[PDB]
Amino acid sequence: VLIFHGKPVHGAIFDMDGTMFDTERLRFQTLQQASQELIGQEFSHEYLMQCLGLSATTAEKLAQRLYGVDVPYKEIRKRADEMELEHIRKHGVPIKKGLVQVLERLRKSGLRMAVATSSRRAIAEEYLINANVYKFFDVITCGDEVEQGKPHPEIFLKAASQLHLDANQCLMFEDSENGLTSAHTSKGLTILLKDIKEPNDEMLEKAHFYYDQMYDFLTDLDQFIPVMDMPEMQEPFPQSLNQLTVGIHGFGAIGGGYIAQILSHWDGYTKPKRIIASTRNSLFREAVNAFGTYSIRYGQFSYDERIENMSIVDSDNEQQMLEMYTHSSLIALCLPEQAIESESKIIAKGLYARFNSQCIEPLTFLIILNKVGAKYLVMKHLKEALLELTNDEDVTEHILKEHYFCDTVVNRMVSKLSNQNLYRQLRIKHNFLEQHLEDVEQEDQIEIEDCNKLTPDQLNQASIYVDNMRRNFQPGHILQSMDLILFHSETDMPIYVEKGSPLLEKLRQVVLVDQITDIQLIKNRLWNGVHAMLAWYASLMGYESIGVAMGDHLVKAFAENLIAEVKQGLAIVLPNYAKDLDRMSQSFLDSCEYAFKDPCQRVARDPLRKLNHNERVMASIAVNIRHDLPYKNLLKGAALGYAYAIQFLEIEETKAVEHLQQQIQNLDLSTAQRRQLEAELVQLIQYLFS
């Protein structure tokens, strides 16, 4: 099924301690802590590095040589074991960075999987349950279930036979020398993972593949497992979390009501364990952190999408914002154009804090903004902010070169819910909590009848657990069928991002492009151009919102006919984006239908600039004329712009005609076509007067 370096892999057998979990470093720490308590002197780092691989008897004799014959080693070792379980049971088993990402890839590739550990069945199961990785494994082979343990191949041969597989059909993951010998001898595809101590030359010669850590194997495995397809609407997010944090600089409409979905989907195998989002909206921050989750409402399908693992912070709080730019692997900048200059300072501090931190991986920075050269604006202000802060030209330029700054194109209209509407929701939801809290003390009491399975010692202990759980969880049972709605968004999925960052290569809701130019030109002419031309027609007819205007057959007919003429043109110019034009065309018409909230004024701002020769309106006309396509609705659209400028913005008609003739001259058209286009357009402008 899964092909790994030209070898068919049907199985994956993992060692537990030192391979899956970082429990060798914990045993390293607990031995030092246990020594400090009892004998007073702390067992040297160097001694413990020497004990890696050696038996408990050999380790004791070494301790006796260094720290005297009467050193209570068995006492220190027994204490260290108590501290290990004590720590693991409350704080959780330390999982190697990359394991869950690897397991999901192997599992979704249809591999049967086992654990081959020298630990006891009882303790091995608790650890795999504690870590929440037991779900990935079909069978477990343990040291107390074999005649001869590692480095004898029995444990790996048995694990393989239990999965209905020959050893040579299985990947075998291992850290220790004895384990690798066991795995190699069994005949499996051995994968040696360095834990603490550098592996000797014999181990590196023996192993089929060697990696410095789990994440290096994940990078290699990613070459043999596919990037998943574009997520559909109402498609679940992954169940399994990785150890990565991601950031949304600006928890606004687009940040909370789109980017959160892309990050929640991630690569389809895992998703980030924490999504940090910044906002000065205190009501939004406290509300989300109170619920521990918010939801995005998709009106068209009446679907409420639960975005979990969210942590909302204050944009003004320095310690929280630096924590985002220090711990995040990917950050999405989702601010308006007129907030870039001010926010560039707190970004510069964030990237400087990351540079000073001992954070080690380059940051992927997505620029989310509906402007041409949006990246340029952010980078220009970020450059100044870094110089102003550090006063170090070498460090400033290092930061700008180190990280991946990605230009993007987004095609999803989103509406952030008002504070009045949120308060209304928080009031009605709080009511249900009181209605829920008034009939949970009606139940009352906790009882466990004669089980005739559990011992009376642990039967009493079971009652205490369920009692404690019931008290804490029961009040939050209402969250099952209760969503904190903060966003109303359309169903447009794909985000176009500049290719470069390795971290984007597996993101399934992302569409990678070598240069953003092409899709940004489409966004300009097909989306923003039509949106402006439609908004000019909406305003003159005297409709409050562009959504209300679609009720008029004239407006809706114009919109459908206008996208058609622009598409026909762009299909010849960019035939490699044929599927993207057809998708975006329909995505625009769907969103325009009930676009009530967002006004026409914002969309219709600066009509003269938008009617430039190389801009969204006039460029489309010139393309259609050159290739002899219908441009009658584009001509009508161009006229509405000059008409809007005169009536609403109070611009003189002389200024409109002066501007027009200059643009027509610049267009790459025949002398005949120029005069024809001028004569037709001026007649439409003088009609809309009356």
Place this chain on the structure above:
Amino acid sequence: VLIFHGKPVHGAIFDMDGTMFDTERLRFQTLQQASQELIGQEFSHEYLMQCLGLSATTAEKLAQRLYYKEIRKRADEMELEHIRKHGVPIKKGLVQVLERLRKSGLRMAVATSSRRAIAEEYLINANVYKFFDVITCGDEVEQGKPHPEIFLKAASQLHLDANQCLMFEDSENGLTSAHTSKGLTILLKDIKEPNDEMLEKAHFYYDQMYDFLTDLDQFIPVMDMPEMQEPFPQSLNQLTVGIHGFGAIGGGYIAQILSHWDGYTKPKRIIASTRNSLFREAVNAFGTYSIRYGQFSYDERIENMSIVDSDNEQQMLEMYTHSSLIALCLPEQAIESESKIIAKGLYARFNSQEPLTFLIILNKVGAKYLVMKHLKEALLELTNDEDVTEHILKEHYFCDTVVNRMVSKLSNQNLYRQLRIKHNFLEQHLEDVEQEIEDCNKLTPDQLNQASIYVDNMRRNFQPGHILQSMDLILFHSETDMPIYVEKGSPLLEKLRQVVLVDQITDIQLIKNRLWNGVHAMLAWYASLMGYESIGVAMGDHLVKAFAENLIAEVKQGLAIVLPNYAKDLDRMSQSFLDSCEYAFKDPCQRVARDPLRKLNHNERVMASIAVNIRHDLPYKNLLKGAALGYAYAIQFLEIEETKAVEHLQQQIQNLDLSTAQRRQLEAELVQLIQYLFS
């Protein structure tokens, strides 16, 4: 685009007061109490009936004609205060209707004469505001009901002609407003007997909301078999459903089928019954439990679960009185004792002034006969009336089922081990929480102060439960077999997604018993005696798979003679069984090998196959080995005495439809083979 009795429908506009919710009754009572403690003289019942589906401004005009702002204000305050305590009284079938129209791709709206502030407050509380694109209140409208402006404006804002829109209404005045708009009117009876003038205007009439739903449903496409990780519906209906036995099948299969339902709505609550108090208190404490599909490492959360005690009468009566569907998931051993609880439930259902779909989940040739026999004897004993019993029996739909899915119930030891580990995480989480919404962000200091109080005590109650985002209560290990096969009859089962209707259920149940459950038990006995604790691992052994394939061959050869019409499909069913067994690693042999003696009965999955093969002179060598291994397991693993196993062996062979020559030969061959296993 939807075709409702020929006419093409593009949209659907609903009235709120009396049509969607039963608020017309509430304001009927508040207006009377509002005119008692202010003016003294209460309103006449003529005035209130004339003020059905009227705006606050319109109702004021009629009041001055006969004889209001101050009166109606206090009436509204009384009304919404009742809603904040007892919730919005939603008309049964509303959420079911709305979702079907929404997924049909129709542009839906609301046309209510109530204020916007009032209209939204209820729509939000009912959680039905998400189903509507635009709403038209009795504020922005210049001339309200019975003038068609409010309905024309609602239709216009959807960007469709009024004649393309369905228009729901309860009131006489509102029905005129709907009719005069020139749309497809629908009338729902609430608190006024429809007049001649009303019934003539209306295109369709229904006694209640749920009657329309049934009529609409024949034009709504029935959704097909759900995929493995396909989500459940988001919107809940008002229907309850029950699971008589929270076991491996009930909790680990039926709960998924009921949670999927029709694909439009999901039952309000699922009531499951069990004596396992650990399982009961675990689910109720967490609020949810998850089914683990090990093959794809997928945890399927099942919510709206209420686990009750089987012994508790009132809780089992609550189940049988208010449930649209009950799933009987008990073994034969308990059928007799549990027939008493079923009798009381069905008798309590009749005494309470929609029929029941009763699913019998049992791996037995003729399972319904056993249940219906014990149920009749149970009812007759309590009721002491033959007239009431024969009605009950022939009223409700008692359906035979075939369950192919292999599911395992988690042991109490492993459930305690889970709770112990997960509790330590909760304790540490309650230390991390450790210990004020400032800045007027477009809100008044009064509201901002009130908001702080709401969020503070919301965090206080919710913050401890945040850990449940990651933490799941795993109670079942299941394979990815979706479709359940059920007997035809019940109209409800026609629309359920995971249900596949068949005619000849008996012939399928027989093959299921012999070829599936019989081989499953016999290879489990063989695997158990060899030291394997899991079916999945056991099938890795060449001898265990070879034995299973040999048994399959001997059973199929027999079934081919008994059912030649099913002989073509046997190879698919036998292969489908081996596929399920091959990688059933979390499915233990002990679960499959339960009740050896019961499964070695003369008319059961083992002895029946042997008898058929003997009669037709077919090879039954491996079948005889599996029978011997069945008694070998009983004596060794269960410890039931050797003498009792022989008394069972002799009694069953005596019952077998064979000649005395064949009976004595079979007994001689089998008892000899039992001794050979030990010695």
